[PDB]
């Protein structure tokens, strides 16, 4: 299964019979060396290739296996975030700002509605209010006061107001460089709503 990756990286064309083994099917490289990692194993590195392919490799090191696995997961998360920037190139503030703005705007939308659907969308906004409360929690801040301050600042017109953990309060977070792609919040909202609807359209359980 590594043949495709190796051929893309170096440019070598695989040879299955000695008759077709010719010089034009070799992949020229600057250097190919086997390096020892301070007595903790040996790695072979092929660095520098004429006409390099569109592949990269990340070597992850750590004291113990658990932190290595967590570092791999975090690096994968970062790569997925950059991918989310690649497609649907839209950026929003983080820090719980989109959730509190959604809560406020959906409360207004509920006030514009009537009947039981108004109550339902008001409950939807109140449920969306949870994420800023959880963000204020786990950081030592008072959740109720912080959430109220977020809501007041967003009603005043500060769309980028969010929870700041460095200063232990509320401030503009675009100056704090806390941003995330749009197709994270949008995807989470859509998928969560679909799952909630699917669960709601359930009334019985049967054991096979």
């Amino acid at each position: 299964e590594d043949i495709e990756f190796i051929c893309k990286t170096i440019g070598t064309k695989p040879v299955a019979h000695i008759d077709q083994f010719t010089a034009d099917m070799l992949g020229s490289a600057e250097l190919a060396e086997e390096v020892n990692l301070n007595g903790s194993g040996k790695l072979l590195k092929i660095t520098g290739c004429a006409s390099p392919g569109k592949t990269v490799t990340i070597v992850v090191r750590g004291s113990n296996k658990l932190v290595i696995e967590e570092a791999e997961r975090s690096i994968h998360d970062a790569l997925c975030v950059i991918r989310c920037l690649v497609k649907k190139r839209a950026l929003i503030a983080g820090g719980g700002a989109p959730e509190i703005e959604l809560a406020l705007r959906l409360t207004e939308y509920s006030r514009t509605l009537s009947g039981m659907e108004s109550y339902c969308v008001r409950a939807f906004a109140d449920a969306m209010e949870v994420i800023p409360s959880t963000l204020a929690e786990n950081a030592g801040l008072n959740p109720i006061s912080t959430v109220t301050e977020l809501r007041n600042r967003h009603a005043q017109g500060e769309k980028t107001a969010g929870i700041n953990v460095r200063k232990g309060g509320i401030s503009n977070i675009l100056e704090e460089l806390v941003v995330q792609p749009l197709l994270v919040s949008v995807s989470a909202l859509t998928l969560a709503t679909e799952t909630v609807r699917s669960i709601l359209k359930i009334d019985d359980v049967v054991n096979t």
Binding site: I3, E4, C7, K13, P14, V15, A16, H17, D19, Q20, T190, L191, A192, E194, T195, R197, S198, K201, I202, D203, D204, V205, V206, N207, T208
Partner: protein, 525 residues
């Protein structure tokens, strides 16, 4: 006396028997339990069940289909087994009506136990039910309307039938889009009935509205290492040859020489034979080559040298679908290139769906094969969407085969019940009571439909019965708000075949269950 209630016991240990009243009681309880379980998942406002498996894998399944619910349940009541088999056979015959036929059979058997309590011989009930079934079938056949001559009317009927089929399932959220998708997919078959030509691909992630019908075809296979990943005006050669260390089929053959040089010469001869086979394939003048079996490294390299895409391990379904969509002929010999038809499509490229890469065929020549990509938030959502789409496709294919259609929303049930009642109040004897019970069950079906929505079912059914007695033969249940409306105007239409099959299968199962007066069980293993 009786076998069980005798001074001498005639049975082995673990084997018993149930006489008339006891066997009838057990059968009726099983049937009513099955009907009550499968119901409440009926009509536009029906809910879904959760099938939690107790096995080691512990599979979780959320479904609205009655047949799937009845398949995956531990059933010990033999009458319940009969009803489950009826539902499975109904699902095999047509895509829809499983819940309808199961509930109709259960209601018929409930009326049967009521009549038995009224001291009526079961044979009288069977005769009355046969007469009522004949009358109801005749009325339903007379009520059918056909629109196969008019293209636009037939298309509108197809859309209405797809909407009616998808109304009950989870796809009702995006009913319009999903019905357009299903109708287009079925119409792309160009009259063929093989639903295997339509491939449903489930990809996790994305909204349910993100599901779409590809304009060409999608393949979930891979391409060789040194072969192009994109070709235009592709000429396709679909094959079923070995191309994997191809040995001569003389199983008694072996290489028996006295030197390793001869072994090397034989090996070079084998490689030359494979090269000659690849050259014969290339003589067809192709751009992409699809083989059903695997392709080893030497033929893959040979294809890569010629710049020919080589897709390997496309199973029987894969090669059949490619032949249907591109018009190529599946080949296994390459000595007569002029006698082999080559598939053609405008573009072949690799698309990125979710986190997986698939081979995309664009601008296909024939296109008599569809790929439907389903996107969802959970695996259960994807499975239920696939089942609902399968039901819609099955019903649409049946409608294409037989264009006769009948009105839904209980209208067909109401008219059949009216005909049964008209027959019932025309003859004497307890067969009249049996036919009245038959009509009562037929009317109970839309009553359960109205129950599922929380509407005033009694008032709605009374209004429908009055309208059908007056002469309004198109009145039904308007489920948008809970009134009676014109199904011709509202566009709530079903396939005549589905309703006829439901009626006949329910009557058949009720008749065969009612005939049983003794259940004898052997010693369990």
């Amino acid at each position: 006396a009786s076998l069980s209630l005798a001074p001498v016991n005639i049975f082995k240990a673990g084997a018993d028997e149930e006489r008339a009243e006891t066997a009838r009681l057990t059968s009726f309880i099983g049937a009513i339990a099955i009907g009550d379980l499968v119901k409440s998942t009926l009509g536009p406002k029906g809910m879904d069940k959760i099938l939690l498996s107790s096995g080691r894998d512990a599979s979780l399944m959320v479904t609205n289909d009655g047949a799937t619910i009845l398949k995956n349940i531990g059933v010990d009541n033999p009458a319940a087994k009969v009803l489950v088999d009826m539902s499975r056979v109904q699902d095999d015959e047509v895509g829809d009506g499983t819940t309808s036929v199961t509930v109709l059979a259960a209601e018929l058997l409930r009326e049967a136990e009521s009549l038995i309590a009224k001291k009526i011989h079961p044979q009288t009930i069977i005769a009355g039910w046969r007469e009522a079934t004949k009358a109801a079938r005749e009325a339903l056949l007379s009520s059918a309307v056909d629109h196969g001559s008019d293209e636009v009317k037939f298309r509108q009927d197809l859309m209405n039938i797809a909407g009616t089929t998808l109304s009950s399932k989870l796809l009702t959220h995006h009913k319009d889009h999903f019905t357009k998708l299903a109708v287009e997919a079925v119409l792309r078959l160009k009259g063929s009935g093989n639903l295997e030509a339509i491939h449903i691909i489930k990809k996790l992630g994305g909204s349910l509205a993100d599901s779409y019908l590809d304009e060409g075809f999608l393949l979930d296979k891979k391409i060789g290492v040194n072969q192009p990943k994109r070709i235009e005006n592709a000429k396709i050669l679909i094959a079923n040859t070995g191309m994997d260390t191809d040995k001569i089929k003389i199983f008694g053959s072996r290489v028996r020489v006295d030197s390793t040089a001869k072994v090397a010469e034989i090996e070079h001869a084998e490689k030359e034979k494979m090269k000659e086979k690849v050259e014969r394939i290339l003589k067809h003048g192709i751009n992409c080559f699809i083989n059903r079996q695997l392709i080893y490294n030497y033929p893959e390299q040979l294809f890569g040298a010629a710049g020919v895409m080589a897709i390997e391990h496309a199973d029987f379904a894969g090669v059949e679908r490619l032949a249907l969509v591109t018009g190529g002929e599946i080949a296994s010999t390459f000595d007569h290139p002029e006698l082999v038809k080559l598939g053609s499509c405008k573009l072949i490229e690799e698309v990125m769906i979710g986190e997986d890469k698939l081979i995309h065929f664009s601008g296909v020549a024939l296109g008599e094969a569809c790929t439907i990509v389903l996107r969802g938030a959970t695996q259960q959502i994807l499975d239920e969407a696939e089942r609902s789409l399968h039901d819609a496709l099955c019903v649409l294919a049946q409608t294409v085969k037989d264009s006769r259609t009948v009105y839904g929303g209980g209208c067909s049930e109401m008219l059949m019940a009216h005909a049964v009642t008209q027959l019932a109040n025309r003859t004497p004897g307890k067969e009249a009571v049996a036919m009245e019970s038959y009509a009562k069950a037929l009317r109970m079906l839309p009553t359960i439909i109205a129950d599922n929505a929380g509407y005033d079912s009694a008032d709605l059914v009374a209004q429908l019965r009055a309208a059908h007695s007056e002469g309004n033969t198109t009145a039904g249940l308007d489920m948008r708000e809970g009134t009676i409306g014109d199904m011709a105007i509202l566009g709530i239409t079903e396939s005549f075949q589905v309703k006829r099959q439901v009626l006949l299968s329910a009557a058949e199962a009720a008749e065969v269950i009612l005939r049983v007066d003794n259940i004898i069980k052997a010693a369990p293993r």
